[PDB]
Amino acid sequence: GSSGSSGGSRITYVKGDLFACPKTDSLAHCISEDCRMGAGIAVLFKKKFGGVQELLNQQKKSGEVAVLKRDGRYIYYLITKKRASHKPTYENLQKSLEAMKSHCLKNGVTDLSMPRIGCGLDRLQWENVSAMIEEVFEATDIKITVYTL
Numbered sequence: 001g002s003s004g005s006s007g008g009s010r011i012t013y014v015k016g017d018l019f020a021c022p023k024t025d026s027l028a029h030c031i032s033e034d035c036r037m038g039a040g041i042a043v044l045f046k047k048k049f050g051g052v053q054e055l056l057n058q059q060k061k062s063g064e065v066a067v068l069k070r071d072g073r074y075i076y077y078l079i080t081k082k083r084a085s086h087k088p089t090y091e092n093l094q095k096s097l098e099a100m101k102s103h104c105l106k107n108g109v110t111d112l113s114m115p116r117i118g119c120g121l122d123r124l125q126w127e128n129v130s131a132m133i134e135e136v137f138e139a140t141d142i143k144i145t146v147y148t149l
Contacts, residue, residue, distance in 0.1 A: 018147035063095040
């Protein structure tokens with residue numbers, strides 16, 4: 001008869017659509033510097049807005065995050081690797097998250113939604129990432145949700 005409530009673990013998992021579910025929540029994911037959006041979920045995104053030409057115009061790089069105003073939300077693009085040839089690193093990832101959140105506060109985005117990130121079994125491991133989001137957002141006022149369909 002006790003509601004399991006523990007510190008941190010502000011990450012919540014939801015079942016169902018990820019773009020049709022949220023009405024105001026923005027989208028956030030990791031991509032390559034060469035906007036090589038052609039693998040995993042990253043593909044859908046390229047189809048939803050497919051603004052590679054708009055993103056590239058930002059000339060972003062590792063540790064930096066890109067922003068795009070589609071209609072009424074700011075889409076973030078975490079950059080960790082430069083090209084498919086280059087595998088993603090945890091070090092960069094963390095930073096990317098710090099650069100992304102920085103925006104939310106700057107403006108006022110207390111709502112974010114991002115799918116499952118961490119392709120490959122050896123490459124990366126959600127267990128690790130999910131943790132980075134805790135330490136990075138450990139001291140913030142932004143709510144995040146992870147959709148799994």
